[PDB]
């Protein structure tokens, strides 16, 4: 019963605002101090924020002091972070955090005091960046060259993630490994997929890679065969 | 880099107890209360001890924590493999105003077998080519531990120039997947005999080559 409920994610360029709230059920939201914390993709937890119970005390880190606002609406159970000139290092999955105890204990006579937290957030994924919305290109990678063979397809150049693949529209699973982007430079991915079949079957079946990328609109069935 | 310092990783075998310890300053954790969290791959963090040593309801009795000062240790017993996770010790800095963490430890659980990356080379499609684009494709999979190196040659000499690299990620067979991509012009495609992907784990190295012929 007790939760909280991220929104408000994105992908954006460099300079763009974002807002993310957090919903929260379970509790007397009014009574808790709250705090954004966020982690960067493969790193640690890095805090980013506080509020206390009432609005009334703020702090942040240095890197976003001026750009990002913390703000609380308590008649409605809701925490905000208000993300303002957005640079690239902001990206992050960021996560809503209760303390572990109320206003009794974390609102003193001099200060605000921090004891843990308790409650997290399921995280809400921030991406920050310059490339702009991309189709992949999808290349067959054919077989050649013991009674099996490899065949894949090559999804290069999109962004922004993710991108889905399947094989024979789903049909063939066995065998099938599709492998994690890789982030180039130029601040596209690319990814690629690979099947593991039969080499005796060339001649009778026809494998074809299903690729998906929504935020481009680009879906692609590219059929793989042996090459001439 | 950051304001509390934990070991990046530790581990020991099913069964064993395993220690990590969060060493700080007296303006964190010589003077406020450190907790510590648990954050198992995909997952927000879980509260395992806060007011230094206390367990909250529904964390059993095999994580402990202790307080020597500025430092602290966390404990935890009768390893599982389901303990495989990060974990973190987090505590308010007086002087900075802010919450701190450490960097993270790794956990690993010992006893998983060792497995042999399985390498695979494609050369750059017909299609590609004609797109004036040319692309290798490396990919490497199943193997463990998940760490390994990858080093690309042409014609016998190393090739630096348009390598990029994933880092290992973890497959649901409990074994790890990485994947390695060298862009080129079809100039300098056809201008060489052969490209080579070679990869290294734990000091032993698989080859593949391809060649345009």
């Known amino acids: 019963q007790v939760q909280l409920v991220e929104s408000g994610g994105g992908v954006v360029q460099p300079g763009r605002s974002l807002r993310l709230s957090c919903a929260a059920s379970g509790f007397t939201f009014s009574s808790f101090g709250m705090h954004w914390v966020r982690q960067a993709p493969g790193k640690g937890l890095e805090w980013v924020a506080v509020?206390?119970?009432?609005?009334?005390?703020?702090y942040s880190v240095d890197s976003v002091k001026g750009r990002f606002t913390i703000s609380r609406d308590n008649s409605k159970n809701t925490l905000f972070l208000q993300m303002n000139s957005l640079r690239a290092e902001d990206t992050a999955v960021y996560y809503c955090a209760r303390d572990r105890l109320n206003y009794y204990d974390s609102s003193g006579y001099y200060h605000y005091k921090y004891y843990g937290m308790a409650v997290w957030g399921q995280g809400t994924t921030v991406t920050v960046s310059s490339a702009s919305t991309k189709g992949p290109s999808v290349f067959p990678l054919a077989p050649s060259s013991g009674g099996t063979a490899a065949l894949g397809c090559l999804v290069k150049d999109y962004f922004p993630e993710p991108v889905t693949v399947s094989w024979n529209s789903g049909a063939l699973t066995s065998g099938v490994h599709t492998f994690p982007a890789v982030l180039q430079s130029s601040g596209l991915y690319s990814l690629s997929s690979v099947v593991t079949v039969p080499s005796s079957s060339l001649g009778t079946q026809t494998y074809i890679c299903n690729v998906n990328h929504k935020p481009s609109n680009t879906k692609v069935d590219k059929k793989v065969e042996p090459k001439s | 880099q950051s304001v509390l310092t934990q070991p990046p990783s530790v581990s020991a075998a099913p069964g064993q107890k395993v220690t990590i310890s969060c060493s700080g300053s007296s303006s964190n954790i010589g003077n406020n209360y450190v907790s510590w969290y648990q954050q198992l791959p995909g997952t927000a963090p879980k509260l395992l001890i806060y007011?230094?040593?206390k367990r909250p309801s529904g964390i059993p009795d095999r994580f402990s924590g202790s307080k020597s000062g500025t430092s602290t240790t966390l404990g935890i017993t009768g390893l599982q493999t389901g303990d495989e996770a990060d974990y973190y010790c987090g505590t308010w800095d007086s002087r900075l105003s802010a919450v701190v963490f450490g960097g993270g430890t790794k956990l690993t659980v010992l006893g998983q077998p060792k497995a042999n990356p399985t390498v695979t080379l494609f050369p750059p499609s017909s299609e590609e080519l004609q797109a004036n684009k040319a692309t290798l494709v490396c990919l490497i999979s199943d193997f463990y531990p998940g760490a390994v190196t990858v080093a690309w040659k042409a014609d016998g000499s190393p090739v630096k120039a348009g390598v990029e690299t994933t880092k290992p990620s973890k497959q649901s067979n409990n074994k790890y997947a990485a994947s390695s991509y060298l862009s080129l012009t079809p100039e300098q495609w056809k201008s060489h005999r052969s490209y080579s992907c070679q990869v290294t784990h734990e000091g032993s190295t698989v080859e593949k080559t391809v060649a345009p012929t």
């Open positions: 007011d230094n040593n």
């Open positions: 509020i206390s119970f009432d609005g009334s005390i703020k």
